[PDB]
Amino acid sequence: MDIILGIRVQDSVILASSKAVTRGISVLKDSDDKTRQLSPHTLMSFAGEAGDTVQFAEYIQANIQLYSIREDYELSPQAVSSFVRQELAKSIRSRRPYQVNVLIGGYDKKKNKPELYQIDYLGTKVELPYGAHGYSGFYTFSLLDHHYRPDMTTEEGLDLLKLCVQELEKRMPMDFKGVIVKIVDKDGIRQVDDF
Amino acid sequence: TTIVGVKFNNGVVIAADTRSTQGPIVADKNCAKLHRISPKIWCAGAGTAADTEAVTQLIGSNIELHSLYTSREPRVVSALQMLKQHLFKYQGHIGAYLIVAGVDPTGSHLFSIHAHGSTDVGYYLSLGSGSLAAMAVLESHWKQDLTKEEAIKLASDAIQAGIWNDLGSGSNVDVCVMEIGKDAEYLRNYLTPNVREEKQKSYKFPRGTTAVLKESIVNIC
Amino acid sequence: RNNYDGDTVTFSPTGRLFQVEYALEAIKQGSVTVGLRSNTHAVLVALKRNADELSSYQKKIIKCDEHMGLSLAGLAPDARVLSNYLRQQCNYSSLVFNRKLAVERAGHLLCDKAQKNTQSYGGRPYGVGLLIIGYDKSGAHLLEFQPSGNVTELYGTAIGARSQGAKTYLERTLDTFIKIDGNPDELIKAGVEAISQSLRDESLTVDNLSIAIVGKDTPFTIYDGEAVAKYI
Amino acid sequence: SDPSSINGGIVVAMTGKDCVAIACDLRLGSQSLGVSNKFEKIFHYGHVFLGITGLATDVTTLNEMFRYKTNLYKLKEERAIEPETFTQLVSSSLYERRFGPYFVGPVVAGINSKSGKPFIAGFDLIGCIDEAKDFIVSGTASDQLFGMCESLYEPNLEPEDLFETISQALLNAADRDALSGWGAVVYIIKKDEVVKRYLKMRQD
Amino acid sequence: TSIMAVTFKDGVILGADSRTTTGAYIANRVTDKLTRVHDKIWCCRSGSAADTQAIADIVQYHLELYTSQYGTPSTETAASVFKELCYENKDNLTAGIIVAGYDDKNKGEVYTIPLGGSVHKLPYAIAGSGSTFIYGYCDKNFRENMSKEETVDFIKHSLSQAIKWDGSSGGVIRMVVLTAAGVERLIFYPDEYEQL
Amino acid sequence: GYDRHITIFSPEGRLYQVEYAFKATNQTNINSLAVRGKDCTVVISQKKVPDKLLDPTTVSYIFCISRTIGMVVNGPIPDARNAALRAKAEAAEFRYKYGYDMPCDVLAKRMANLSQIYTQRAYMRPLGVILTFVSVDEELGPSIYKTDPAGYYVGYKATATGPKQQEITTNLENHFKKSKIDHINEESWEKVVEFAITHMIDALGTEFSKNDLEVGVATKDKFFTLSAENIEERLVAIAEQD
Amino acid sequence: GSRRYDSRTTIFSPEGRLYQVEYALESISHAGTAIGIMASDGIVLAAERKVTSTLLEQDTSTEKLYKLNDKIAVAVAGLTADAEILINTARIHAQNYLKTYNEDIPVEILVRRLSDIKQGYTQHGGLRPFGVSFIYAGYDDRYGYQLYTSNPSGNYTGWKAISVGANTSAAQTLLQMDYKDDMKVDDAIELALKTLSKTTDSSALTYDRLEFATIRKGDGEVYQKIFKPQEIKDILVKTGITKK
Amino acid sequence: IGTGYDLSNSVFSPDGRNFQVEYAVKAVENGTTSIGIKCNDGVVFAVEKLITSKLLVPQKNVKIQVVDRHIGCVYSGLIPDGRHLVNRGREEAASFKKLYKTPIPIPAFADRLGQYVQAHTLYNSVRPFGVSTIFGGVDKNGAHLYMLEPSGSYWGYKGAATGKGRQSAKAELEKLVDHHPEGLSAREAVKQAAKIIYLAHEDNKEKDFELEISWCSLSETNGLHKFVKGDLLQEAIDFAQKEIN
Amino acid sequence: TDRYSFSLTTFSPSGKLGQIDYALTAVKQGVTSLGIKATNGVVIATEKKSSSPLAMSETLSKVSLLTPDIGAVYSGMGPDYRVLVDKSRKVAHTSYKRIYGEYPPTKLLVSEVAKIMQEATQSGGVRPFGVSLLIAGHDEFNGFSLYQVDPSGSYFPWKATAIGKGSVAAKTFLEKRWNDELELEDAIHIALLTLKESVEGEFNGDTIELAIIGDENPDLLGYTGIPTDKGPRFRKLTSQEINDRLEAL
Ligand SMILES: [Mg+2]
Ligand SMILES: [Mg+2]
């Protein structure tokens, strides 16, 4: 599957997503952004079955932007995560469920705290300092359990993500054509120019 | 499970075991399987225990409403018909197999209903896993014009056969007697032959045995 | 009349339905059309009404099948709905039973379709009257349909403003036009003469006249414009 | 695979003299890959506690729904719900989806505020109420918990002895299950005091 | 299951066994397989017990309504009701029903409704699991306009042979006789028909 | 205003359409009475066939609902037959769903609840009929239960309905005040029919022939209407009395 | 058919006003007087119970003050049944928001939901609007303490201190005379009690005829105190309006 | 006390009447004459068709309608309402035959039509039927003739009549009932119905008329409903034309 | 086709709902009923007015059992009260018993009936209920209680009250004669006196109806063996008991 990784440090939240989307036996695109900005301080990365991913992500994005415009207020990452897990839980028991797994990285301004939520397509939600969906966890979770610290900086988290990407490129059969890295902090969401 | 029903000259008795099995594991060592449809109409359930409980509660509620509407005593044939139609509407997807007995202004009645909507009547009936042992006892000891005590003993012996010879049934025996002139008497744990033996050792741990990381009080008011 | 002309759901003390009568009056205001028939052919002639001299003459004849059609007098959209229902009925007959719909059965169907509006609250009776010509296995047929539901089979008739002139003409000319067999042009001339009899200060022009002809060995055919110039 | 065996987890409730106990493991994982060690499985509404094992999304959905229902119950009745009423509510809610069930194994514990009686009950995925006085078990290590409880439990013990017994049972049952462990919490509930203790255990 | 219905001079007689089995186990050895849908219109059932019982209940309801509205229904009316029920629900029904009725206008009549909902009027009809074993015998012994006693004996012999050969049939032989005198119930125990 | 047109409350708090249905009940100009025997129940109704072109056998206001329940209707025959069809359907549905014959009082309560629905919902008008159900219920015995367009229903030892209902009611009241019992202490139903016919003769002050009466008798598990010949036999037995 | 009997509840007057809205407002003007005052350290609600009898049980009766959730409460002026229906729907919507977001619902969102329901009743369906006016007292973590008002018209507003029901103009004038932005909860209780005692139609203001409630901070946790009859009597005798 | 009780259907006047039903009856009284006569083993129906103009095709625009294969129906009043009613009756008979196989009994069919017409007087959203219907036929219990009113009231008659000349027709019908206790013959019933139509035409003597006859008899029509046409029609019409003078 | 989708009860320009006031008038014109709450039970009473002595008094029950611990009486239109009692019996199961496994408390059942009547006052094509209800009940958490429900959908608790014709005189009598220490039998006697004041015809055990929500009757349970289950507290009084207490008066 696609590479969806996320880490929560003391001052920001970093999300990494694979750039490769392949259909059939051909890598169709090598510069794909698998993230949707829900709010100026809350980003969501997504991966799963073709079609369902973009549709579900943009649906959640439209709902979040509608709520933001209505109340002139940015929803906390916890409320957005609960909303998304409820939508996925309603989906799985519908006629045709959404098969999309998401990572929500946000900055709660009311608490000045970084929050990372992992939600699978079944509607299961957790708050983790580092998370992943698919086979990425099997490689990266040992490295994070070993090296990750709660008081890490953004650059240290970027180094940890680079180590994870190197381990993935080394011990994975799929060529995911690198990753796109985005950092969410008090100044909003930004994308690393080159990784 | 093992449930039986036996009619006697002035009423009807039902009996059951008290053991619910979650697969091969005994979940409850004293699960009462006698359910009350009406104050004088009882039944015993087998199969999907949740389905039996649900259908019995639904039919009992509707029967109470029917009795309040008609201002009459509930009839066993009414419970029979309602249960049969409800179970037939779902084509056996409600895995409830019931033995329904009762007394009403029309006399004493004992029927059995299967999950697909079938119903049969008789003087002695048995359902469940150990139903065969109980049925053997019923075919070996039943006679016409049974007394109250004779029917009670027959039902108890049938449930004992189902308890000892069938692995699906065990523990104690619950009985419910419904006579024409008196109130129904519900004997919970009529016989207690499987009382557990005393353990060889008391396993009280010395306080502090468990490793505790963090303790905190949570607010409940 | 007063308190009993609010809807088609209320009877009058004398037993009248004033909304249906108002619909019949709406028919009367419509332009005059007249139909006649013989044992071989059936002809429908119609004068279309222009609002002003720059307005076009509204086609008042509608083809329902290759063997049956009608002419309208009154509200055009109600005529459209009724003719579409009749087209669907003929199509259903031809498709399901490989059988041309009988004119009498089509009349019964139009009767019921009009009655279903004159008994239920809401909506309204139709504001159009129809003259249906057809040629089926029973021969030629002419029907007059009113929105009250009464459909009557006639040798010749007319509806619209001052239709009584052409009606009494056809009544006088019955023995003549009922036996014009084997010739369409003479029956068309008779219908033209009737519609001329029912005219005041107006003259039949190539624009005002519309003809429809059905019969044996002839499908339902419409003649407009120069096609009617032979009968002017 | 098996819906109830995807996330794992275990809950066990026990009863003692004027007290109850409810303990649960902290593991949440996708099959073999454990993903979170901070997934508590015991929730509380008023003075009635509810542990839920099985598919984690259904656990969370049931927690939120029962919170909803108990809040409306408190607003309408102007009183907190009792463990028996909440047990009946859980049973009815589980049966309401008989043909599309929730892959859960709820376990209710508490002490009735008026009677003071310790009450525990268990449910299957369709609401069948197992009202046993000794102990209720649920989760992937249900057989190990059954053995531990049948061996260790004896009635009418003080809350401290009850804590020791239920903690030993939960720990030695989780250490025999691959899908359980990664931390454990134990609630000791007495008429007017609820204590919550985290346990130290092997982290594999 | 072994059911039959025979018309004779004085009316009709329906006969059946009393053995209902779940596989190889005698679930009920005292089953009344003759069900009354109207005062003088009865039916023998075979197949899914629940399906046949439900069809009989609905037919009895419809016949009671027919009696309340337009008077006593004929045997053909109950046969057509059974036929409509079995045919319009053929995809979810497993029932074979022999409907026998006596009215003063048409004397006695026997209709049979096999799977698929079809309906056929016969002087005598046989159906059920054991029916096969007694086909030829019946065709060699049935006669028109028999007396009551000889008709009872014919039905007894046929059902005894069916019970002896078929393991799915047994118990006692239950007969319902519909005549101008009314409804008569006969029961014949094993010792009577086994000795035959 | 329009409070007199639909089933809403007037400023006085009265439903005028209900009262007008009550008034319409007497449109047939026919009286009826019901009495209870020792083990039977008898209803007598005035049979009036004015036009001789009518088939007098097709003129009836008594209906056989079920095998046990009979119902005599005071009011126009369209609403009478409507209520009859509804009552037969309800009795059959009850027998099907609950496994026993619908009791008299239960059918009366159901029809009264339907009348109440008519009394509270504007889209339906009450039926201008008064229904008297009679049976021999297994749990109760001889049963007479009457319902009206107001949704009200109640059971009687004996009852009367019609234009001269007041007179017949007062007569029956007087008789049951003299006998001090709640039923006619007669074993045979023919004598109870004769009693009812005699008291109707006394109340209405007119003599009847066998073509002026409709008799319905309900006994244990059978309700049946008497033929003109049996009615004439009862009238002859009455003429030979004191 | 039934067109003659249609009252047409959702129509505009030639001036541009809804008949049923004005008539329900008139009905509410005949109802009890409810007053909310928002002080810098809490919110207070006080209402006058119309029903009076020696045999009425005031302890278990709460006709004017209701609980929407644990952090929002309401005072009702008008028909008690319509009010209870709307309050049940409001509780349901609040619990739905809580289930969806795991966060308590803000006050303005609930008020706007109820007001939109009322507006829908004054625009479609051809039904009578709820003859109920609401005073919402709430606290959320964004705007803090909030006092809102809603009427059958479906419009809602925010106030520092406001009253609905009977004698609205005189009560508002008295409040405007005696209101200050720096006052505290006890001063607000005094002001509301005095305004009620001066705008009441009864002889004297007794504890049986009124209800009181306070949303306070007593911790970082807000609390709703619904005043029991004895507490109402004590606050009455303390302010001097009544005597022991 | 009050006014305007006649402006809405199913509204009870203070006396206890439904004035819309009586207005529909007024509408049926304006209609043409139609009669039905029950003989020994069947029924006969006859109707007068007003010749508005001689442009009308004779023997067409039939008024009597056949239901199932054994029921005849004629109606006076608003002809389209009669066609609606016979369509509903055909649907009822089709359902009855589908469920019960036996052709619908005449009392059952009468009760069906009566319940339909009655339900058309229960709601102010529907207009009562503007026709009075004389129908019937032969079933296993014999011959049956019924007449149904816009109120939903229907009865079994020995003879029935409705329309402008109904009274005269009714009088003649009574004479028949008075002068034939044993019963009429099917052919004699047809002849007498022709006579009665010619007699009742005198009230509508303003315009010419055309007689239409049908009959359903066990011996003469084998139980089926058949139009009286050809030689028998001419015989009955000559009988009536001779008896008129 | 039902086209009565518009509300029949609307607001008048004076600020009153006309149909609700008319239903209250119809209630005031109904036979007087009353209720009195005591320390250990509540009593409900009314007059069983018979139009004709041919009618049987038992065939018309104004007191109706809702739940084994909740009974009700009415004043106003009989049939509306009957349909309300049927709907209340149904909602007591379909809304509370089939969910929580127990009979609903008094206040919740009263609120449900009030919701029914409010919908009656607002729904399209429906008139309000011309009935006022006095519902007596007992639950384990609220003790004994007596509530009154009006056509408008409002409901309120009462230590003692009455409604109907003699409402004002009965209420004034109850105000002077009620105390918080009153026992059940004293409340029964006071109810008998108040009803006697409000009756013009015969006043005996066969003409008046009276019921009590008091102690539990295990003999009226119909089954024995379950000590947790207790008998119903609702009990209708027999004619003999009423006549005995009247003769003692
Ligand atoms: Mg065993
Ligand atoms: Mg482990």
PDB file of C-alpha atoms in Angstrom, chain B residues 103-188:
ATOM      1  CA  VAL B 103     -53.495 -22.248  32.664  1.00  0.00           C
ATOM      2  CA  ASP B 104     -56.330 -20.002  31.504  1.00  0.00           C
ATOM      3  CA  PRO B 105     -60.172 -19.880  31.723  1.00  0.00           C
ATOM      4  CA  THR B 106     -60.175 -22.608  29.050  1.00  0.00           C
ATOM      5  CA  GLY B 107     -58.080 -25.051  31.104  1.00  0.00           C
ATOM      6  CA  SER B 108     -54.466 -26.242  31.133  1.00  0.00           C
ATOM      7  CA  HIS B 109     -52.328 -26.172  27.990  1.00  0.00           C
ATOM      8  CA  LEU B 110     -48.862 -27.400  27.000  1.00  0.00           C
ATOM      9  CA  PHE B 111     -47.340 -26.789  23.562  1.00  0.00           C
ATOM     10  CA  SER B 112     -43.946 -26.621  21.880  1.00  0.00           C
ATOM     11  CA  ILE B 113     -42.898 -24.108  19.217  1.00  0.00           C
ATOM     12  CA  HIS B 114     -39.933 -24.415  16.856  1.00  0.00           C
ATOM     13  CA  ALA B 115     -37.888 -21.547  15.456  1.00  0.00           C
ATOM     14  CA  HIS B 116     -39.362 -21.876  11.953  1.00  0.00           C
ATOM     15  CA  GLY B 117     -42.955 -21.443  13.145  1.00  0.00           C
ATOM     16  CA  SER B 118     -44.043 -25.021  13.778  1.00  0.00           C
ATOM     17  CA  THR B 119     -46.168 -25.910  16.803  1.00  0.00           C
ATOM     18  CA  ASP B 120     -47.144 -29.222  18.392  1.00  0.00           C
ATOM     19  CA  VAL B 121     -49.162 -30.305  21.429  1.00  0.00           C
ATOM     20  CA  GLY B 122     -48.749 -33.219  23.819  1.00  0.00           C
ATOM     21  CA  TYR B 123     -48.898 -34.355  27.418  1.00  0.00           C
ATOM     22  CA  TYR B 124     -45.104 -34.600  27.767  1.00  0.00           C
ATOM     23  CA  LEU B 125     -42.598 -32.596  25.731  1.00  0.00           C
ATOM     24  CA  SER B 126     -38.842 -32.046  25.793  1.00  0.00           C
ATOM     25  CA  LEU B 127     -36.520 -29.676  23.938  1.00  0.00           C
ATOM     26  CA  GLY B 128     -32.826 -28.817  23.936  1.00  0.00           C
ATOM     27  CA  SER B 129     -29.593 -30.772  23.743  1.00  0.00           C
ATOM     28  CA  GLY B 130     -30.373 -33.345  26.432  1.00  0.00           C
ATOM     29  CA  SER B 131     -33.949 -33.554  25.143  1.00  0.00           C
ATOM     30  CA  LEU B 132     -33.369 -37.182  24.119  1.00  0.00           C
ATOM     31  CA  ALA B 133     -32.474 -38.437  27.614  1.00  0.00           C
ATOM     32  CA  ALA B 134     -35.418 -36.534  29.096  1.00  0.00           C
ATOM     33  CA  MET B 135     -37.715 -37.897  26.374  1.00  0.00           C
ATOM     34  CA  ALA B 136     -36.533 -41.433  27.154  1.00  0.00           C
ATOM     35  CA  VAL B 137     -37.408 -40.917  30.823  1.00  0.00           C
ATOM     36  CA  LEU B 138     -40.774 -39.442  29.793  1.00  0.00           C
ATOM     37  CA  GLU B 139     -41.517 -42.461  27.594  1.00  0.00           C
ATOM     38  CA  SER B 140     -40.482 -44.794  30.414  1.00  0.00           C
ATOM     39  CA  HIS B 141     -42.378 -43.207  33.331  1.00  0.00           C
ATOM     40  CA  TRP B 142     -45.344 -41.229  31.961  1.00  0.00           C
ATOM     41  CA  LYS B 143     -48.911 -42.344  32.624  1.00  0.00           C
ATOM     42  CA  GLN B 144     -52.393 -40.899  32.311  1.00  0.00           C
ATOM     43  CA  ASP B 145     -54.036 -38.991  35.177  1.00  0.00           C
ATOM     44  CA  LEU B 146     -50.764 -37.913  36.765  1.00  0.00           C
ATOM     45  CA  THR B 147     -50.960 -36.076  40.069  1.00  0.00           C
ATOM     46  CA  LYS B 148     -49.143 -32.824  40.817  1.00  0.00           C
ATOM     47  CA  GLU B 149     -46.333 -34.534  42.731  1.00  0.00           C
ATOM     48  CA  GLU B 150     -46.025 -37.328  40.157  1.00  0.00           C
ATOM     49  CA  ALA B 151     -45.673 -34.850  37.285  1.00  0.00           C
ATOM     50  CA  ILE B 152     -43.184 -32.786  39.306  1.00  0.00           C
ATOM     51  CA  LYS B 153     -41.064 -35.874  39.993  1.00  0.00           C
ATOM     52  CA  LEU B 154     -41.269 -36.959  36.344  1.00  0.00           C
ATOM     53  CA  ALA B 155     -40.110 -33.550  35.106  1.00  0.00           C
ATOM     54  CA  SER B 156     -37.320 -33.484  37.697  1.00  0.00           C
ATOM     55  CA  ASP B 157     -36.123 -36.945  36.637  1.00  0.00           C
ATOM     56  CA  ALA B 158     -36.201 -35.948  32.961  1.00  0.00           C
ATOM     57  CA  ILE B 159     -34.103 -32.866  33.711  1.00  0.00           C
ATOM     58  CA  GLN B 160     -31.767 -35.033  35.809  1.00  0.00           C
ATOM     59  CA  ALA B 161     -31.279 -37.385  32.858  1.00  0.00           C
ATOM     60  CA  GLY B 162     -30.556 -34.412  30.611  1.00  0.00           C
ATOM     61  CA  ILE B 163     -28.108 -33.074  33.201  1.00  0.00           C
ATOM     62  CA  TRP B 164     -26.144 -36.266  33.841  1.00  0.00           C
ATOM     63  CA  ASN B 165     -26.110 -37.838  30.372  1.00  0.00           C
ATOM     64  CA  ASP B 166     -25.859 -34.705  28.180  1.00  0.00           C
ATOM     65  CA  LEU B 167     -22.886 -32.342  28.236  1.00  0.00           C
ATOM     66  CA  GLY B 168     -25.009 -29.355  27.189  1.00  0.00           C
ATOM     67  CA  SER B 169     -27.074 -29.493  30.393  1.00  0.00           C
ATOM     68  CA  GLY B 170     -26.066 -29.536  34.033  1.00  0.00           C
ATOM     69  CA  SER B 171     -26.061 -27.758  37.398  1.00  0.00           C
ATOM     70  CA  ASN B 172     -29.459 -27.418  39.146  1.00  0.00           C
ATOM     71  CA  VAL B 173     -33.120 -27.858  38.180  1.00  0.00           C
ATOM     72  CA  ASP B 174     -35.722 -25.077  38.020  1.00  0.00           C
ATOM     73  CA  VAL B 175     -39.431 -25.947  38.091  1.00  0.00           C
ATOM     74  CA  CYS B 176     -42.683 -24.058  37.531  1.00  0.00           C
ATOM     75  CA  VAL B 177     -46.061 -25.585  38.417  1.00  0.00           C
ATOM     76  CA  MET B 178     -49.288 -24.077  37.057  1.00  0.00           C
ATOM     77  CA  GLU B 179     -52.507 -25.470  38.538  1.00  0.00           C
ATOM     78  CA  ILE B 180     -56.065 -24.699  37.487  1.00  0.00           C
ATOM     79  CA  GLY B 181     -57.234 -23.367  40.850  1.00  0.00           C
ATOM     80  CA  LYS B 182     -54.120 -21.869  42.439  1.00  0.00           C
ATOM     81  CA  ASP B 183     -51.419 -19.375  41.545  1.00  0.00           C
ATOM     82  CA  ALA B 184     -48.386 -20.581  39.621  1.00  0.00           C
ATOM     83  CA  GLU B 185     -45.532 -21.637  41.918  1.00  0.00           C
ATOM     84  CA  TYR B 186     -41.975 -21.060  40.671  1.00  0.00           C
ATOM     85  CA  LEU B 187     -39.395 -23.276  42.400  1.00  0.00           C
ATOM     86  CA  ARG B 188     -35.996 -21.751  41.642  1.00  0.00           C
TER      87      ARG B 188
END
